[PDB]
Amino acid sequence: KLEFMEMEKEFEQIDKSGSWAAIYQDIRHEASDFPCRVAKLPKNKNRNRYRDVSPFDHSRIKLHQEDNDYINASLIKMEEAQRSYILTQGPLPNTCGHFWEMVWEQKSRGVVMLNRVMEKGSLKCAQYWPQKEEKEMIFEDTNLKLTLISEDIKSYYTVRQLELENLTTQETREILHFHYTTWPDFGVPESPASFLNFLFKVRESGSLSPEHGPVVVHCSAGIGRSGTFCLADTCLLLMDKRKDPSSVDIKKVLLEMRKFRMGLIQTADQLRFSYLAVIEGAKFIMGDS
Numbered sequence: 001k002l003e004f005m006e007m008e009k010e011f012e013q014i015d016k017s018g019s020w021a022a023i024y025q026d027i028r029h030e031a032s033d034f035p036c037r038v039a040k041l042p043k044n045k046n047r048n049r050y051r052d053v054s055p056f057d058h059s060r061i062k063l064h065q066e067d068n069d070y071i072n073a074s075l076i077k078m079e080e081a082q083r084s085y086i087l088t089q090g091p092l093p094n095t096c097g098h099f100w101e102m103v104w105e106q107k108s109r110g111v112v113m114l115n116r117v118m119e120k121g122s123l124k125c126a127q128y129w130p131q132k133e134e135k136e137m138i139f140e141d142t143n144l145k146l147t148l149i150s151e152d153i154k155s156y157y158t159v160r161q162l163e164l165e166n167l168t169t170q171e172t173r174e175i176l177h178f179h180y181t182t183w184p185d186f187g188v189p190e191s192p193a194s195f196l197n198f199l200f201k202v203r204e205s206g207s208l209s210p211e212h213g214p215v216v217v218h219c220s221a222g223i224g225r226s227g228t229f230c231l232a233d234t235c236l237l238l239m240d241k242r243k244d245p246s247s248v249d250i251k252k253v254l255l256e257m258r259k260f261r262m263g264l265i266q267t268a269d270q271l272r273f274s275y276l277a278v279i280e281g282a283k284f285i286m287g288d289s
């Protein structure tokens with residue numbers, strides 16, 4: 001019952017002592033590390049948005065086509081939580097087709113975007129989806145067509161329904177796009193509430209359901225904001241599935257997740273926000289409806 005009061009006091013104790021940085025730095029340095037030889041092949045240089053952010057070879061997503069199967073994307077599969085996610089970087093001008101090719105092949109139903117599209121700066125991301133219902137997009141290289149069907153703009157996020165079509169088989173699928181628009185690079189969401197509401201909308205859509213392929217999650221690099229999002233979702237699932245909610249160790253889960261893609265969660269504030277959201281979120285789910 002008051003098992004949250006203990007976690008909250010604990011959380012408050014860490015805030016009091018100002019140990020978030022030390023806690024975060026301790027987690028970072030125990031992170032596993034694995035090869036990324038494919039990401040580093042010369043022919044894949046223009047497929048990577050950032051020189052130092054690469055998917056591990058063991059968990060990378062492979063494109064089912066031609067000569068090059070490479071995309072900066074990693075499959076994160078959390079065994080106990082029974083949930084998988086594909087974490088990728090914000091699509092580049094030359095990788096938008098690869099991006100949708102992946103959504104198709106992996107049979108993903110939803111796309112979660114946590115950054116903003118920016119054509120200028122160092123933290124970018126291309127306009128990989130149509131902004132106008134009347135102007136659909138065709139990706140020649142991967143023979144796919146995308147059409148914006150609907151758009152519901154809220155103040156903190158925007159939900160969009162898209163229609164993706166395999167120009168070859170001519171079949172089509174409905175892809176749901178959940179765009180959280182107010183999450184700065186290396187920053188935190190507007191508030192725990194706004195973040196939890198966003199996360200709940202994604203859940204409700206059934207986009208995270210085992211019925212479909214894993215949801216595709218990305219930001220600019222696909223590690224800080226995406227890592228934060230996935231960690232909170234995963235810890236919430238564990239706190240529900242487990243007999244004891246306080247038994248969930250955020251450090252353990254983040255380290256576990258980091259075995260699949262490097263650098264998840266980029267700042268100590270993002271780690272603290274993550275824990276703050278899991279605590280409030282768990283009080284909602286295992287709370288009184």
Ligand SMILES: O=P(O)(O)C(F)(F)c1ccc(CC(Cc2ccc(C(F)(F)P(=O)(O)O)cc2)(c2ccc(F)c(F)c2)n2nnc3ccccc32)cc1
Nearest residue numbers: 050051052122185186219220221222223224225262263266
């Ligand atoms: O929410 P996100 O995921 O979109 C993010 F905002 F957090 C983000 C943005 C940019 C980067 C690449 C970065 C810095 C970087 C490189 C490698 C890692 C690591 F995961 F491998 P780690 O194990 O060291 O923790 C982390 C961070 C960057 C930072 C700031 C910028 F302005 C920029 F353009 C690019 N990056 N990647 N390669 C780089 C080479 C030189 C400098 C920064 C570099 C990483 C994460």
